[PDB]
Each structure stands twice: as C-alpha cells, then as structure tokens.
C-alpha cells in the first residue's frame, strides 16, 4: 500500500453522508494495513479529485488559456474539460502538446471555428472569433471528431449577439445541424444571444450543455422559465466567468428551485487566482455554498455529474475502489469573503473551501506540512 | 581523425568563384572537413554537389495552421535542409511553433513573426478558409516585443501581408513597429493599394519585398513596362527581393520583362503549402522553382546563389550553412541536371515548356545521410 | 482527390498483377476526375510498406532513426519499434515520437527498464541489463495495460553475451516468458547467440510470438547438425509463431537463409533492424526496399516478399484492413515502386557476397492521403 | 503596473536587515516602485522572497524514474528555478531539453551526466540499478558535442562518485575531472561513500565546481579523525569551490552538519536532491522550504539560508540579477512566505531526529509575472 489517508470524513455524494474511514491507494488506483506514506486528514473532508467542466487550457495555442497542471492541481482539481479553445486546425496539436503530456486529465469540446478561441485574449487588442457558417469545414470537423471520439465530447459554439452583429446563416442552426448529422453533443456560450431562452432551449437534447445558465446579460432564463425546466428534466445539462454570472438570476432561479447541474469557472489567465468573480473552482463552489446550495449538491456538480458527461463514470469523480487515485483533501473554513458578479453586486460570505492536499494518479502533487 | 562520410567524384559548386571544383568532400560529425578514407563513401560521379538548399519563404507550422507542411518529410528528399517560415505564427502561437516544430525538427528553421495575433492559422481549408486580421487596432505591441526580444536567435523580423474598416494602415503601422523594435520586415505586397514606386520607399537594407514577380495589380513595372527606378535603387541599397512562386504570386510577363532589363531576384523561394507541395505545375518544390528559373535564362550560379548564400546571409548564418566550405554545417544536396520536357505554369495560366530540371538524388543533413538513392 | 493511373497492382492473394487505377479521397482509398493525377506508368502500386523490426525512439536512444525522415522516401509508412523503450521511457517515446509522427508506429515494450538507450555511439556503448532481478513487474504491467493499443508485447534480447559473466538471478528468457504469459501478452526475442538450441528454444514460443533474426547463423541457428531446419522450428511456424528475418549488421547469414529457403522455410516477416548505423549506409541493411531486394535475388517469389512487408505484419499489429492493403476504405498508405535492373551486391554477417541483378526503387509515397514523396519524373 | 505586493517585508541579504516595502511587477519583470495596480496582493505579516532556487533536483520526468515535474510540485512551495543534477546524459539530453526544459514554466538549467543515459536506470524501487560510470564507456566526442551546442543551459558535468557504483578501467573522478578540464567547464560530484578522503578528493576541485552532499557523513565525511573540518576543505571554499548540502534520503548526517557549522563551515548552497520518493513525503527531504527550515532550526542565520537558495545558486547558473534577487528588472519570480510556529520533526540518514519550533510556509507564488499559486487567506 503506497498511500493511506486516515482520520478524515469522506463525502458520500450518493447518500449525502459523511463516512469515517481511510482511503487506500496502490499504484494509481484507489483500493479497498501498513502503508509507505500516511496522510493525516483530521478535520478535513475527503473529496474526489475535482472536475472543472468548462475551462480553457490550450496554452500555447491561445492567449486566454492557462496550464491546468500548474494552477489547478494545488486547488484540488485533477480533471478538466476544455470548452472549445481549439478547432480542427489546431486540435491535434492541442492534444499532442497539452492533453497527452498533462497530468490533469483533459477532455474537450471541438469548436466549430477552425482556429478556436486563439484570437481572443491579450487584453482589448484581442478580437472575437469568426462563427460564420460559411467558414465551417464540415469535412475536417467530422475527421477530427471521428479520429478522436475518446476525447472530444461535442462541438462548442459561442452564440452571443455581438459575434455576428453579416453571415450566410445563423451559427447555432448550422452548428446544431452539424452536431445532429455527426451524432454528438453541443455546448453553447448563450450569453447575449440573438434569440430568447424559450427559443434556444428547443435546440438542445439529452447531453447538450446550456452554459452560463445564470448570466442575465440580455435574455436570461427568467421572464423563471418553464421550457428550460422541462429541458433540464429531459437531459440538458446546465460557468461563472467575468461576464457570465449575475446574482439576480442565480438567487432567483435557485429560490424557485432551479439548480445548475454543473459548476464551472471559465478559467482564463485573466480570471485565474485573481478576481472576486472566478479565482478558482473552489472559490466558485464556495459562492454557491453561501448562496444556499446544499453542500452535497455542489460536490455532485463538480464530481459525479461531469464525470458522467465525460463518459468517465466510476473512473474519476468518485472515491470508489478501482477508481483513479485522484483525491482532494479540503477543510471548510470560516472567514469573511466577498463574491462579486458582472454588474458589481457583492455577496459577503462566511465560509470558503480550502484545499490542503492533492493526489493525482496516486502521486502526492500537493501537501501542506500542516493542514 | 577518422572521417565519417566522403562524397567522391562530384562537381562541387563554388558559388563565390562561380566555378566548379573536382574534389572530394569530407565530413566528421556534423561539420565539413577540408580534404584539399571514411566509414561511408558516396559516389557522386556525374553529379553536381550543392550545399544544402535554403527555402526562404515556406509555411511550415504544421499542427498550428492549415496551410503548412512538415519540412522534415517533404523537403529533405528534394535537397532542402534549411528554411524560413514567413509569418505562420503570431505572438499567440509562436512559442508553441518553436517548441513543437522548430526545436524537434531537423531542417533548421528560422522565422518571421506575423503581426497578427494568430499568424496565418485562419486560412487553408479551401473556400472555407478565411484571411487573417491585419488591423493595427489588434496589434499587441507589448506581446510582439516580448516574443521578438526573447527569440532574437530565431525571429528575423515581422511578416505582414499587404493586399472591413481598419484604424491605421497595416504597412505604416507595422514598419513603425519594426523600426521601433529594431528589426526587419517582410511584406507580401501583392495587390497593394499603393504603386511599387511609393511602397518601396519604406524598405531598408535587409528587408524583404516578397513576390516581386507577382503581376497582379500594381507590379514592379511602370505603365511603360519597365522596372521602376526606385525598385532598382532599392536593391542597390540592400533591399531583398524574393519571388516566392506561389499559386497566385508569379506572372510570366512580369518575370520575363524584369530579367531582360537586368532585374534578377536575390532570393528564390516557393511559398510552400500543402496545396502546392508536390502537386501543381507552379510551386511543385524548390527544385521545380529553381528549374523554372534555369529555363528562364537565369545563370546557374545565380539561381543557386539565390537559394544558398543570399538566404544564409539574411538568416545571419554566413559560413555555417548555404555553403560547402570547411567548418560549415554538413548540409549537402547531390543533384543531376536531367533533360526532359517540363512545363511551368503561372498565376494567369500561361505555360512555358522547358528543356531540363534539377533532380535531387541524395541529402546529407547535420552530417547524417537522410536521403540516398541506391543508384543516383 | 488523388488518382494513380496506368499502374500495376500486386495481388498477393492471387499472385498476379492487375492494371488498375487507385483512387484517394481524404485519407482513405475509395473504389474507383481528381484534383491531382499521378502517372504511374511502368510502376507497381503497393500498399504503404511496413517495417516490423526497427528502432525509432530517436532522442531517447542513440541507435534510433526518425522514420518520418529516412523511411517515407523508401516506401515505408508503418513501423514497429522492437523494444527501444522500457517502462521508464515508453510514455516519453509515445508522446514525443509516436503521437506527432506521420509514420504509424506500434511498439514492443522492452523488459529492461530503460530499453536499448545504452546501446549506441559506437564501441563506447554497452549492453543493456536483462537481469530478471531488475524487472519491475508492476510498472511493466501498468505501462502495458494503459497502452494496450500500441504495445503488442514485450521485447527481450537473449544473447549469451548479455548475461555471460554477469551473474544474473534467473534466466532472462524464462523470466520474460513467465511475465509475458502472466500478463496475457506476447513476446519478441532477439535469438542471436542464444544459450539454448533452436529445438529447445522454440518450445517457449506460442502463437503470435516473434522469433527475431531467424537466419542469424551465429551460434545456435534454426538448422540442426546436418543442415536441416528443425522439425520443431517448422511446427512452430505452423502453430502461429511468427518468424522474422531482422537483417541487422550481424543477424543474417547467407548460408542459413539459402538453406532454409531451399527446404521451404520462408520468414513470415522481412524487416531491417533499422538503426542509425545501418540506415542508407551498408550492403547488409540499407532500407526495407534493400532487404526485400536481397530476398528477391535469393529466389523468394515476389508476391511473398510483398506479403511479408504488408499483409502479414499488418495482422500482427492488429491493423488488418486499415494498412498493408490497397482495398477500399483502408488508410491511403501507398508506395509506387519500379523494378530496376542493375548489378547490386548483398553482404551478410561474415562478408559473403551475392551479386544480384535487380532492386526495388521507390518513386512516390502517399501517407494519410498526402503526397509526401514524388520524383518529378520517375 | 500589473501586480503590486503590499504590506510585506523584503529580506536584505547584504545588510542583514528586514525592510518593510512593496514589490511591483510589470509584465514579467520586477519594477522599481521605490518612489511611487491591476492586482494587489495583501502580504500582511509575510516575508517577500524571490522565487526560490533548488540547485540539485532531478526533474527529467518521462525519461527517468526518479524525477518529478517541477511545474507541478515545486511552484506551489516557492521554487521557480531549478538545476537538474545530471539526470540526463548525451543520449537523452536534447529530449530532456525539448520535452521538459523548453515547455516548462520553471527555469531549469542542468549539468550533463558523463554517463550516456544519465540516471535513467535508477529508481522504481529496489528493482532499479546504479548507472554505469566506467570511463571506458565515456563518449567524449558526444559529451563535447552536446555541451558545446547547449552551453547556455549545461553548466558543467555531473558524476556520482560512490564506491558502491564502481565496486572498471580507470577512476571515474580522475577521468571525469580530466574531461571537464579539457572541455573547459565545471564539474559536480556526489561526494558520498567515495574511495578517496575529503582532503584527497578536494584537491581536484577548481572554482565553480560543486561539492555535492557536503554534510553526508556516510563513509568519508568532511570531518577528519578528530571530528574537525579538513583545512583543505576550508581552503577550497576560500578558493571558490561550492559546497552544496543537497540532502535527499541518504546524503545528510546530523552529526557532520552540526559539527562543521559549530566550527564555522556553512554550506554555500542548500538544495534537496528532489526525487519522486522524497518529494512531499519523508521527514528528511520534503520540499526546499522544509530543508531550509531544518537549517533555520539548526542555527543558520536567515540571510545565509536565503542567500544559499537565492543569490549563490543564481550566480552559478550564470544568471546574476535575473533570478534569485528582488532587484529591479529581475524576472518577476516572487515567493511570499510566513514563518509558522509549530512543532516539526527533522530526520537525517541515520535516523537521528531534531525537533524544531518553526518552519517556512509558502502562501503565494508569482512566476514570470503570473500568479501561479495564491491561497485565498494567507
Ligand atoms: Zn468559455
Ligand atoms: Zn506567404
Ligand atoms: Zn534489434
Ligand atoms: Zn542526486
């Protein structure tokens, strides 16, 4: 036995309980007693290796992306999904130079645009991507997708009104048409869309990601809405950036009982370890704790739920035996901490989640001397 | 002191004396040794021995762009051992291009850094591709300056293609950045808003006027059909002129008119892309473009010079490559001049039937035999 | 779109040539007005050639070559690396060589932790350590399972000189075979100067395993004391044991090969044992085309040479139908070769020469539907 | 201004004082704001150090078994620049450079190991084996080709000179030292369990050469028969021979360290011998900050510990003024630490333990002008 974690509280997302037991690690697998290394996790909660489902981590190919193996592991994140940073032109290089050598397990959505989001970033000198259906290379998209079905979960398209404010057709209608023909899912930046929520939501199906559901910049999900709630119960999964979160939509929607199925960060160089809006995934989870979301439901939105969407159920996002030894050891801390949205509205919280140790593929990649 | 490779019985091309030398070349390691007996002996009987050719305008950011090729795959078997990427990458994707292509590659690649954020990553799929954004409103100077300063051992300057409602002029803004950051420029300058008489006034010694024989819009010829005075004056000062025979950057009428008036390119290159590599009758390879110029009345030792010594100078590598002299890097291309009817095409469709073509039979790169026909 | 016109297809199954045109769309062959037309008049149109024992972990080993550079011009588009990498460096080999390369590369994982990284630079190189006491069974198992799509088994080099003197714990062959059996995989073994006789040796091999350097003729060959192929060697080939004539610089003997082919024993795989020392350099190995041309001038039928570098290894690489064939929907890996007439000498390990009269000369190479080598006139 | 760190305390290594001051970062450089941003870091009650420098780490991950990725495990504990102590040799250096050094955020210099494969054979448990240091296998043409084509990164040659390694044709130290001198560079030597004595072995060291594991006490230590530091050792530090304590799991003796410091011999450089086995794990090595804390609790002044991990290593990497300093126009490599009071155990090779009452804890890390680690509450 290579590592043992003793004296901790395991969060059992299945039953909403805290289990008093040790974790066993041999190789890169959690197993079911002497151990070469013993971790003392007293007062800590043992979580599965966290999964940030909407990030941008094609560093070197874009200006906005960060290296997840450098900034995410120390805050408990061991797996990520890239939200269409790459397109068919640069996906293979993204896979060969980032995904394959990274320790953070990275999945991805292929962007409709061929170069992805490489044009945004670097400040205001950056420019928006070209979402014109006239420049969709369907032959290359299908080729990239079919040769990489084990890493690309779907197609990513950003549908903000400003990206197209004179195209041949509507970028959504054309994308969703491609997605259906290619038998795959879609993920849509919906902030400031040309259509209203009651109209866009008719284009989504079981497995598709309606991202930044709580944005409220333009047509929000509030008049809440009944077609969105129907789509959520049909199988449509529902990313705080610097502009894609509004407290008024979030407080209202959750007051009415609507909850996001996935919590993400839209992690960028601009909002990594730096704002009161994103900072880290833990910071984003901590806001939902102080916004009334139940703890075991926050944990589900960053472990079990995305790990099924990445088609990795039982492999990650769980502390079961035979799972990858991806463990995040956190302590819930009581301190005054402020959360901000797009409009500048603040919320003063009483607690935040602080990561004290990270184990990735059975290796101690992060461990404070004293938790 | 035991030699590693000897190429014997070949005709060595001395570009400086414009003559051939009948002697053997010695190689120990990755260096050329003076043989004024080895592990491996190559018989260049009936062959001309060139230094490793240098393609000065190719696009070789494979993986990061849609138009590039891999030089290690398609360029070594046709004699080319060094290359310069003409702005495939911008400040966003350069360091990836240098880490994932340049550093692992064998073909020595120097580069020009495009001013656009993403370089030329945006064109390529065919009709679905689209042109790059040269808006000076999107020039990240602090990023361009950071990329240039941290990689002055590789970036020779900035590339711009000069052919929406921008803020400034791309060429004026770029030359301003180029001059401010104290480096050189390279301009596509095909279908330009200004006549060649005006545009050339901003070029300096070591700058690159690319696609000089393009003949699509304002060419290097006046309405009388003669090479502009300032164009000739520019080359006298030190401005470099490069043909880069693309699929739409070469016209027969302009090229034929310039060389009869005594205007010969300083650089012969290809604008090599996956579309024009080993495929067309316009930019088939560097040897195909060189062969086009032999069949055009360009002296042999001038065509070689335009792909060996002139580029090796502009990449700040005099004596290291582009030559077969002692202590040079062992980049050797062994060729035969073969006689056969071969047709060259231009952007307009005009055709020229030629008599011969250059044919590579062997390539030594960094002292290693990377291409060697069994019988030359 | 590429169409290759006026060519001759080799049919390894029906052992005849066929005048037909090959069609390319995307990266796959289709069943036949194209963007690019290639005049292959007076040419044999082969599948992309497959070199089964090469050493291609460049950057990590001193002996390896970059297959994208030196192999594609000679018709080879797929290769298998005969154990240059061990469990220590396989992932680096896969990420820095295999994934970005254009030549499709499967591999055998060396049983030694670091592989053959110590075996180059000339005489200063030294033999790898095949002591079973230094096998990391857990790391070998881990590397195999997390990469079962690219690793076809374990590679062992089993010369007397490797273990001679160095007092190893157990016998490397018995240990590596035991591990290969326990791990439900296959083995590939350098057999040159093996301690055991071929009749004894071959009793450890099973269907799908590789007997590398079958014509090595240094020590215990596949010939008995009267010059005949052992009946056990012959029975093993029938069971499924794949015999491979890896033409090293010291792994081929004309007297053993000629005898074996006189008695009807033909190697199932023709390969090079390609290293930076024997690539484009010698008279023993030079290219895959060179080694095949030796067997052509040695009496082996052409359609059986072609199969031993196409259909057979593609099956062992578990890629049947995608490569090693020109059938529709296979990957567009195409080699255009010409049968050239010229005096050519082939040398073996001891210096025995054979003056042949023909060799195969590659003229154009298609890889993943892309022209990557094309003589302007061939 | 991009980043300013308010309310901290720089540590002046020259004047041996602490100054409450602010740090300004623009782009990737520390700017001078001494006479008056986009992000403000509250460093209340923290010591503002430069990015720490670990001088003997093993970070050729992928190509070795003992190496860690410094980008993952070293940045969050304050390290932004490292030197690899001969994990790679001439065979695998360029792959080490292209696949780790070039793409890494941590700035990694290196020493080339005289062994061809470096330390790739080490680790993975007891199944690993010692590298081959026989001078008969030194490839001097390749070592010289590698160094001279990579002199901006290779600071010298590394040899591990223990008896258990060579227990050969010539003495590896004598041969290595000679090669170093002929090649005109510096050397670095694991001086643990060596054949020669400390006074005898030090006579081969010039200025800029590293005497690794100076406090090892395993076999021949820097202490004579009377428990006193050798005069020739003391004379060498005067000349400019750098003594690095490293540490690791077997190269640190508490008796030797305590004696040699009681007589005024303090190590010029403090490092870890960081490996996959001693990273974040033992009570011996754990991190640089853990090792520095052991030296803090051992009676070493704070400015000397900080110097031995800031200025002194940055000098031997030929990078004075770019890293290891907070001066204006240095690389924006900042470490923000607190000196926590707590009961912490320190262990040495032989098991001897020393209980301390403090240790350094890293709360934020800035690398090349980017926040790569920042606790929400320091
Ligand atoms: Zn996004
Ligand atoms: Zn161009
Ligand atoms: Zn072999
Ligand atoms: Zn060490």
Other beta carbons less than 10 A from residue C282's beta carbon? 14
User: Angle at Cα C290 formed by Cα C287 and Cα C296, nearest 5°?
Assistant: 150
Burial of D36 (0-12, 13-18, 19+ CB in 10 A): exposed
Taking each helix axis as running N to C, give the angle between helix D140-148 and helix D172-183, from 0 to 180 degrees, rounded to the nearest 10: 40
Q: Which three-class secondary structure state does DSSP give residue D34?
A: coil
User: Angle at Cα C262 formed by Cα C260 and Cα C268, nearest 5°?
Assistant: 50
- Cα separation values, C211 from A202, C84, C173, C216, C245, Å: 62, 17, 12, 11, 8
Q: Which residues of D58-96 are buried (b: 16+ CB within 10 A; e: fewer)?
A: bbbbbbbbbbbbbbbbbbbbbbbbbbbbbbbbbbbbbbb
- Cα separation values, A189 from A63, A209, A267, A273, D306, Å: 19, 9, 14, 23, 48
What is the distance between the alpha carbons of residues B355 and B339, in angstroms, rounded to a whole number? 6
Record the tokens describing residue C282, joined without a space. 């010698």
Inter-chain residue contact D145 with B29, CB threshold 8 Å: yes
How many interface pairs between A and B have CB atoms less than 8 angstroms apart? 87
What is the distance between the alpha carbons of residues C348 and C357, in angstroms, rounded to a whole number? 17
Q: Is A244 annotated as a binding residue?
A: no
- Give distance in angstroms: CA of D33 to centre of ligand 3: 63
D288, HSE (Cβ side, Cα atoms, 13 Å): 29
What is the distance between the alpha carbons of residues C162 and C160, in angstroms, rounded to a whole number? 6
Q: Which three-class secondary structure state does DSSP give residue B264?
A: coil
Record the tokens describing residue C36, joined without a space. 């690019």
Inter-chain residue contact C376 with B277, CB threshold 8 Å: no
D205, HSE (Cβ side, Cα atoms, 13 Å): 27
- Chain A residue with Cα closest to C142: A27
What is the distance between the alpha carbons of residues D303 and C319, in angstroms, rounded to a whole number? 63
Provide the terminal-to-terminal Cα distance of chain D, rounded to the nearest Å: 23
- Cα separation values, C319 from A83, A149, C186, D193, Å: 33, 18, 16, 53
Burial of B249 (0-12, 13-18, 19+ CB in 10 A): buried
Q: Which three-class secondary structure state does DSSP give residue C117?
A: coil
Burial of D28 (0-12, 13-18, 19+ CB in 10 A): middle
Record the tokens describing residue A361, joined without a space. 């593929």
Other beta carbons less than 10 A from residue C331's beta carbon? 23
Cα D296 to chain center, whole Å?
Answer: 16
Burial of D310 (0-12, 13-18, 19+ CB in 10 A): buried
What is the distance between the alpha carbons of residues C300 and C266, in angstroms, rounded to a whole number? 8
Burial of D340 (0-12, 13-18, 19+ CB in 10 A): middle
B74, HSE (Cβ side, Cα atoms, 13 Å): 28
CA of C153, closest CA in chain D: separation in Å?
21
What is the distance between the alpha carbons of residues D125 and C136, in angstroms, rounded to a whole number? 8
Which position has the token pair 């630079």? C121
Dihedral sign (CA C219, C220, C224, C227): negative
What is the distance between the alpha carbons of residues D57 and B336, in angstroms, rounded to a whole number? 54
Q: Which three-class secondary structure state does DSSP give residue D85?
A: strand
Which position has the token pair 């990755």? B30
| C-alpha closest to that of C139 among C125, C151, C157, C149 | C151
Inter-chain residue contact B64 with A137, CB threshold 8 Å: no
Q: Which three-class secondary structure state does DSSP give residue D199?
A: helix
Phi/psi for D276 (5° steps) reads -60, -25
Q: What would you report as the CA-atom Rg of chain A, rounded to the nearest whole angstrom?
A: 20
Best of A62, A92, A93 to disrupt the B interface (most B CBs within 10 Å) is: A93
Q: Which three-class secondary structure state does DSSP give residue B230?
A: helix
What is the distance between the alpha carbons of residues C53 and C244, in angstroms, rounded to a whole number? 8
Of C73, C102, C370, the CB nearest to B371: C73
Record the tokens describing residue A108, joined without a space. 């991805």
Residue A151 backbone class (left: φ over 0; alpha: ψ -120 to 50; beta: rest):
alpha
CA of D99, closest CA in chain B: separation in Å?
8
Long-range contacts of C98-101 (CB under 8 A, 24+ apart): C98/C150, C99/A95, C99/A96, C99/A100, C100/A96, C100/B63, C100/B100, C100/B104, C101/C67, C101/C68
What is the distance between the alpha carbons of residues D110 and D86, in angstroms, rounded to a whole number? 7
Please report residues of B whose CB lies closer than 8 A to that of D145: 29-30
Q: Which residues contact B188 (CB under 8 A, 6 or more apart)?
A: B160, B161, B162, B163, B210, B211, B249
Best of D88, D90, D91 to disrupt the C interface (most C CBs within 10 Å) is: D91
Cα B303 to chain center, whole Å?
Answer: 12
Q: Which residues of D125-164 are buried (b: 16+ CB within 10 A; e: fewer)?
A: eebbbebbbbbebbbbebbbebbeeeeebbbbbbbbbbee
Provide the terminal-to-terminal Cα distance of chain C, rounded to the nearest Å: 21
What is the distance between the alpha carbons of residues A61 and A94, in angstroms, rounded to a whole number? 7
Written as one string, the DSSP assignment of D214-263 is: TT--SSS-SB-TTS-B-HHHHHHHHHT-EEE---TTTS--HHHHHHHHHT
Q: Three-state secondary structure along chain A?
A: CCEEEECCEEEECCCCEEEECCEEEECCEEECCCCCEEEECCCCEEEECEEEEEECCCECCECCCCCHHHHCHHHCEEEEEEECCCCCCCHHHHHHHHHCCCCCEEEEEEECCCCCCCCCCCCCCCCCCCCCHHHCCHHHHHHHHHCCCCCEEEEEEECCHHHHCCCCCCHHHHHHHHHHHHCCEEEEECCCCCCCHHHHHHHCCCCCEEECCCCCCCCCCCCCCHHHHHHHCCCCECCCCCCCCCHHHHHHHHHCCCCCCCCCCCECHHHECCCCCCECHHHHHHHHHCCCCCHHHHHHCCCHHHHHHCCCECCECCCCCCCECCEEEEEEEEEEEEEECCCCCEEEEEEEEEEEEEEECCEEEEECCCC
What is the distance between the alpha carbons of residues D257 and D229, in angstroms, rounded to a whole number? 10
Record the tokens describing residue C352, joined without a space. 């025995």
Record the tokens describing residue C176, joined without a space. 């590596």
Give resolution, Å, one decimal.
2.9
What is the distance between the alpha carbons of residues D179 and D195, in angstroms, rounded to a whole number? 20
Q: Is D290 annotated as a binding residue?
A: no
- Cα separation values, C5 from A127, A179, B277, C37, Å: 47, 38, 20, 7
Q: All domains of chain D, ordered by start, with CATH?
A: 52-316 (3.20.20.140)
What is the distance between the alpha carbons of residues A279 and A274, in angstroms, rounded to a whole number? 5
Q: Quote the longest CA-to-CA distance of chain A.
A: 67
Other beta carbons less than 10 A from residue B151's beta carbon? 15
Q: Which residues of B169-186 are buried (b: 16+ CB within 10 A; e: fewer)?
A: ebbebbbbbbeeeebbbb
- Cα separation values, C235 from C194, C207, D136, D274, Å: 20, 11, 45, 54
| C-alpha closest to that of D50 among D323, D316, D292, D305 | D323
Inter-chain residue contact A364 with D279, CB threshold 8 Å: yes
User: Angle at Cα B147 formed by Cα B145 and Cα B148, nearest 5°?
Assistant: 65
- Give distance in angstroms: CA of B123 to centre of ligand 2: 11
CA of D65, closest CA in chain B: separation in Å?
23
What is the distance between the alpha carbons of residues A66 and B128, in angstroms, rounded to a whole number? 29
Which position has the token pair 């037309």? C37
Q: Which three-class secondary structure state does DSSP give residue D171?
A: coil
Q: Is D58 annotated as a binding residue?
A: yes
Of A100, A139, A143, the CB nearest to C95: A100
What is the distance between the alpha carbons of residues A243 and A241, in angstroms, rounded to a whole number? 5
Record the tokens describing residue C220, joined without a space. 């215990």
On whether the CB atoms of residues D88 and D49 are closer than 8 A, the answer is no
DSSP bridge partners of C343: none
Phi/psi for B375 (5° steps) reads -125, 125
Q: Which three-class secondary structure state does DSSP give residue C154?
A: strand
Which ligand does the CA of B61 lie closest to? 2
Which position has the token pair 């991806």? A326
On whether the CB atoms of residues C356 and C348 are closer than 8 A, the answer is no
On whether the CB atoms of residues D76 and D362 are closer than 8 A, the answer is yes
Q: Which residues contact D242 (CB under 8 A, 6 or more apart)?
A: D208, D209, D210, D211, D268, D269, D312, D316
- Give distance in angstroms: CA of D223 to centre of ligand 4: 21
Which ligand does the CA of D277 lie closest to? 4
What is the distance between the alpha carbons of residues B288 and B359, in angstroms, rounded to a whole number? 9
Q: Which three-class secondary structure state does DSSP give residue D306?
A: helix
What is the distance between the alpha carbons of residues B102 and A5, in angstroms, rounded to a whole number? 45
Q: Which three-class secondary structure state does DSSP give residue B71?
A: helix
- Chain B residue with Cα closest to D142: B29
Enter the DSSP assignment of B178: H
Q: Tell me the residue ranges of DSSP E strands in C137-228.
A: 151-157, 187-190, 210-212
Helix spans in C87-157 (H):
90-93, 137-145
What is the distance between the alpha carbons of residues B48 and B334, in angstroms, rounded to a whole number? 6
Q: Which helix (H) or strand (E) holds B257?
A: helix B252-260
What is the distance between the alpha carbons of residues D30 and D39, in angstroms, rounded to a whole number? 14
Q: Which helix (H) or strand (E) holds D288?
A: helix D288-296
Best of B101, B102, B104, B144 to disrupt the D interface (most D CBs within 10 Å) is: B104
Inter-chain residue contact D127 with C135, CB threshold 8 Å: yes
Written as one string, the DSSP assignment of D97-151 is: IIIIITT-SSEEEEEEESSSSTTTTS-SSTT-------GGG--HHHHHHHHHTST
User: Angle at Cα D58 formed by Cα D57 and Cα D62, nearest 5°?
Assistant: 150
Q: Which three-class secondary structure state does DSSP give residue B357?
A: strand
On whether the CB atoms of residues B162 and B216 are closer than 8 A, the answer is no
- Cα separation values, C57 from B77, B81, C63, C93, D146, Å: 21, 22, 8, 6, 18
- Chain A residue with Cα closest to C91: A101
Taking each helix axis as running N to C, give the angle between helix A138-146 and helix A171-182, from 0 to 180 degrees, rounded to the nearest 10: 40
Residue D133 backbone class (left: φ over 0; alpha: ψ -120 to 50; beta: rest):
alpha
Q: Which three-class secondary structure state does DSSP give residue B313?
A: helix
Q: Which residues contact D235 (CB under 8 A, 6 or more apart)?
A: none
Cα D366 to chain center, whole Å?
Answer: 19
- Chain D residue with Cα closest to A352: D376
What is the distance between the alpha carbons of residues A167 and A179, in angstroms, rounded to a whole number? 19
Other beta carbons less than 10 A from residue B34's beta carbon? 10
CA of B99, closest CA in chain A: separation in Å?
9
On whether the CB atoms of residues D30 and D3 are closer than 8 A, the answer is no
Other beta carbons less than 10 A from residue B78's beta carbon? 27
Q: Three-state secondary structure along D313-367?
A: HHHHCCCECCECCCCCCCECCEEEEEEEEEEEEEECCCCCEEEEEEEEEEEEEEE
- B351-365 and D47-50 beta bridge pairing: unpaired
What is the distance between the alpha carbons of residues A80 and A290, in angstroms, rounded to a whole number? 24
- Give distance in angstroms: CA of A320 to centre of ligand 2: 55
Record the tokens describing residue B104, joined without a space. 């692992």
Q: After which residues is chain D broken (C to N over 2.5 A)?
A: 36, 167
Residue A124 backbone class (left: φ over 0; alpha: ψ -120 to 50; beta: rest):
alpha
On whether the CB atoms of residues B81 and C69 are closer than 8 A, the answer is no
This entry's atomic model was obtained through: X-ray
């Amino acid at each position: 036995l290579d590592i043992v974690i003793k004296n901790g509280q395991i969060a059992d997302i299945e039953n909403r309980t805290y289990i008093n037991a040790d974790i066993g690690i041999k190789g890169n697998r959690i197993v079911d007693l002497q151990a070469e290394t013993v971790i003392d996790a007293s007062g800590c909660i043992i979580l599965p290796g966290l999964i940030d489902f909407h990030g941008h981590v094609f560093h070197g190919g874009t200006a906005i992306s960060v290296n997840p193996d450098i900034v995410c592991l120390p805050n408990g994140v061991t797996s990520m999904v890239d939200a269409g940073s790459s397109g068919w032109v640069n996906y293979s290089l993204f896979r060969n130079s980032v995904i394959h050598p990274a320790m953070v397990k990275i999945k991805s959505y292929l962007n409709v645009v061929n170069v992805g989001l490489s044009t945004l970033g670097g400040g205001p000198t950056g420019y928006l991507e070209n979402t014109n259906p006239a420049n969709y290379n369907e032959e290359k998209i299908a080729q990239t997708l079919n040769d990489n079905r084990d890493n690309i979960l779907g197609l990513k398209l950003r549908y903000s009104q400003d990206i197209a404010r004179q195209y041949a057709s509507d970028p959504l209608l054309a994308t969703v048409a491609l997605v259906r023909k290619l038998e795959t899912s879609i993920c849509v930046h919906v902030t400031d869309s040309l259509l209203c929520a009651d109209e866009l939501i008719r284009y989504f199906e079981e497995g598709d990601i309606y991202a930044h559901c709580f944005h409220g910049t333009g047509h929000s999900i509030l008049n809440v809405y009944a077609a969105i709630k129907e789509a959520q119960s049909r199988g449509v999964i529902f990313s705080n950036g610097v502009a894609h979160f509004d407290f008024k939509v979030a407080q209202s929607a959750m007051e009415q009982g609507f909850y996001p199925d996935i919590i993400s960060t839209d992690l960028t160089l601009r909002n990594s370890l730096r704002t009161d809006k994103v900072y880290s995934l833990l910071h984003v989870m901590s806001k939902y704790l102080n916004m009334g979301m139940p703890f075991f439901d926050v944990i589900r939105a960053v472990t079990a739920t995305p790990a099924r969407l990445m088609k990795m159920q039982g492999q990650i996002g769980t502390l079961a035996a035979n799972a990858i030894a991806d463990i995040s050891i956190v302590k819930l801390r009581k301190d005054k901490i402020t959360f901000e949205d797009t409009r500048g509205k603040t919320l003063e919280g009483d607690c935040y989640l602080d990561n004290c140790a990270t184990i990735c593929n059975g290796q101690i990649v992060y461990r404070r001397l004293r938790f």
